[PDB]
A paper describes a structure:
We solved the structure of Cps4B in two crystal forms, P212121 and P43212. The loop is involved in crystal contacts in both structures, but it would protrude into the surrounding solvent if the protein was in solution. Loop βF/α6 shows a significant conformational change between the two crystal forms P212121 and P43212. It is close to the active site and contains several hydrophobic amino acids that could potentially form hydrophobic interactions with the incoming substrate (e.g., Leu172, Phe173 and Tyr177). The loop is not well conserved over its full length, but many Cps4B homologs contain a FG(D/E)K/R motif in this position, where the phenylalanine corresponds to Phe173 of Cps4B.
Since the dephosphorylation of bacterial tyrosine kinases, such as Wzc and CpsCD, is a crucial part in the capsular assembly process in both Gram-negative and Gram-positive bacteria, the phosphatases represent potential targets for drug development efforts. We have thus characterized representatives from each family: Wzb from E. coli K-30 (denoted WzbK-30) and CpsB from S. pneumoniae TIGR4 (denoted Cps4B).
Author numbering:
A (entry chain A), B (entry chain A): 0 to 243
């Protein structure tokens, strides 16, 4: 029973599901693949994802009703994926934006080419609030490309890393769009710099969950024990508000 | 990975472990049997279990450190087993006594021969506080012996039932001390009146966890699906603060 801590399943709030039907379909697929817990982390990002918090709550609650139709033992928790801009700090401290399952952990996102010093500075200011940043899809940031020294630094301040399930997969030979993130992801896993693997699922045409598959690949390359850590135990600790 | 929502693992606080050594030994056994989550529910009972709440917290936190020695993926949550006396209501509402994992659920206990009207009255007054009572070892109460009508009533007010793992086991032919609770437990399982099975573990000489075994017996008699509900899914919902 996997716990997916990064998901876009709330409808009409961001670039995830546009309808209830689409939300129900996502949940169902996630369930097929063995996920029994999903943390909703819709986008909060000044400039492009500014849906009112009240509306996200409204729709999330509806999605939690829908989950019941998929399966009685599917647990939906609230949360958020937060794109760092300065305003975000007070919003977090005052609790106007959710942490993951109301725990100490917050899912934090940057741009592909955010300079390292900006990522670092931002993550410091969040730690100052007593909140623990889990860094969203570290494969994305150029700042961290092939750079363990920098990732260790962040982990050692008190951050934890998340990698997307789809970037654990192997590169295709025709029509690959994520060569660099797949290469980057594989490097972090080799260096043992990954705490969590999550789906970042948005839909069932382009951004599905690849959790079942990502799990079998990590099992083979890195061992069953590591797959369980990244896909179950560490997420378990996050959702239970305990330090990993 | 089972979740045990009823446990006496804090030392020098009640009739559970008397030492750290004994606490560590309990955790370890529970882990052997496949339990990955344990809710601490030490005794709060006017008249015989009156250890100051500050002291229970102090020692619980230490037990949570010890758990790390047993295994990194063992999660210890705080809670309490509450013996109903009137004072308990305000203590709960004001939060001077913990609910299970700080959820809406509280583990509630009575005496073997508490008349039904007293159990009922007490459980009403707790529901009035917005708290959901999970009834501790229902096998114990004479009021509920062979009496589905009464158990359904309670469940329908909004209570949930817990049965002890050791009372799921088969009766012995020499030196059985729990014939009646084993018979009673078996009856509730047949009538499908049990939401949760938990250990009520106190030690490793007389009151061990019988979770591994209780799980295999429920599997055989009632199906894998039911064992998972009682030993994993329903407890999962309790610890995640979601209505079962
Ligand atoms: Mn998106
Ligand atoms: Mn993102
Ligand atoms: Mn995302
Ligand atoms: Mn006891
Ligand atoms: Mn008891
Ligand atoms: Mn007990
Ligand atoms: Sm290295
Ligand atoms: Sm490691
Ligand atoms: Sm019946
Ligand atoms: Sm049932």
């Amino acid at each position: 029973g996997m716990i997916d801590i990064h998901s876009h399943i709330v409808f009409d709030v961001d670039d995830g599901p546009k309808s209830r039907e689409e939300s129900k379909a996502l949940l169902a697929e996630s369930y097929r693949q063995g996920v029994r817990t999903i943390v909703s982390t819709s986008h909060r990002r000044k400039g492009m994802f500014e849906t009112p918090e009240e509306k996200i709550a409204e729709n999330f609650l509806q999605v939690r009703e829908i989950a019941k139709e998929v399966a009685s033992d599917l647990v939906i928790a609230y949360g958020a994926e937060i794109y760092y801009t300065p305003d975000v700090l007070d919003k977090l401290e005052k609790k106007r934006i959710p942490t993951l399952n109301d725990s100490r952990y917050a899912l934090i996102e940057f741009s592909m080419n955010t300079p390292y010093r900006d990522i670092h500075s931002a993550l410091s200011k969040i730690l100052m609030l007593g909140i623990t940043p889990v860094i969203a899809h570290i494969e994305r940031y150029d700042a961290l490309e092939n750079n363990e020294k920098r990732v260790r630094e962040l982990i050692d301040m008190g951050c934890y890393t998340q990698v997307n399930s789809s970037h654990v997969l192997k590169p295709k030979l025709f029509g690959e769009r994520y060569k660099f993130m797949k290469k980057r992801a594989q490097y972090f896993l080799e260096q043992d710099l990954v705490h969590v693997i999550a789906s970042d699922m948005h839909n069932l045409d382009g951004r599905p969950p690849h959790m079942a598959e990502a799990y079998d690949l990590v099992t083979q390359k890195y061992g069953e024990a590591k797959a369980q850590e990244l896909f179950i135990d560490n997420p378990r600790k996050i959702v239970m508000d305990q330090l990993i």
